[PDB]
Symmetry: C3
Subunit: 145 residues, 3 copies
């Protein structure tokens, strides 16, 4: 379309930014993240929707809806589903014409052992981790490059 269209998906527990450990996830809340993304995309003439759900199936539904509605790119932080949701992986793989960047706020490589492997990342075009909330901006830049 006339402007790039991006969907940002945040998975379970990410609506509790701020409430969760600030030394891991930073001082700012989910509303702050949404506003940051919205303002950045407006400054770049990018259409963006920020979506969050705790439900694995709703995330898959949202990815499928992106197939039909002109979405060019997805930025996704699957939350803990990153490490086990082969269903979200297959959803991401099913939208073969949508570029996808996986984001994690923290450096998941140095987190608990269960966070070290992502089952969604192998079907994504890229990824970013360990940059704080600005990782979402960096992911948008990867899609807009």
């Amino acid at each position: 379309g006339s402007h790039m269209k991006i969907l940002v998906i945040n998975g379970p527990n990410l609506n509790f930014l701020g409430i969760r450990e600030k030394n891991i996830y930073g001082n700012e809340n989910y509303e702050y993240l949404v506003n940051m993304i919205n303002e950045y995309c407006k400054s770049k003439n990018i259409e963006v929707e920020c979506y969050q759900s705790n439900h694995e199936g709703a995330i898959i539904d949202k990815i499928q809806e992106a197939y039909f509605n002109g979405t060019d790119g997805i930025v996704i932080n699957p939350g803990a589903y990153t490490h086990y949701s082969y269903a979200i992986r297959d959803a991401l793989a099913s939208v073969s014409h949508i570029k996808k960047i996986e984001v994690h706020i923290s450096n998941v490589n140095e987190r608990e052992e269960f966070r070290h492997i992502s089952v969604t990342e192998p079907v994504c075009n890229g990824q970013i981790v360990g940059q704080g909330l600005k990782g979402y901006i960096m992911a948008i830049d990867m899609l807009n490059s």
Copy 2:
């Protein structure tokens, strides 16, 4: 009841048949599969409902509803949940008077390593894989035997 009653459950991403890789999943879409099942069951005087959801919990809800509504048999392709949903496994096991056949379209034994083991199949009465869409017909025949 007067005719056998079957529920066909398709799990996450199976509504994207056709859109997904045709050399894996075949040329035809989910509507085609539903129609194929419906027509076959009509020809055999079998009552059938085709259901699909991306939500693990909705699949479990649907299995539980089958307990109360006279369902004789379930054909289920759990999608990627096959490999990790012990919750769907326990749901299938909980309906001890309902015969169950697991279906996969592709030969999951020769897929990615994560697809090689099914955690749902040990509580099913049978299974079929690698036959394409006709595996669903074969599963119906197993239930109707």
Copy 3:
């Protein structure tokens, strides 16, 4: 508040108590369990809500709602999600001011191998297993101690 407030969460398949194997799960149904909990808490001047869902995301939603509504303690039997839902684990960890007790009806240590490890228990304050339905009462007593 003026009385302790507890939320009891039962995960997938626990609404099928009674219907499931009685030699594993006991003779009594889910309604019986709810009534038992309600009566006990009334006798102790404890406010309680019993909640059940088969949906991983609804369980997470319910845990998050407990943050905002004055809940003091959660008793949770995550069902099969115990063994794989890092998303429920992170939800429980996110409510750092809510005491949490994990319950299992059966002795999960002597169940199938896949039931031997709980991924939710490391973020709970306690746990109880193998006591039958009275484990829920024991969990309430742990919270009320």
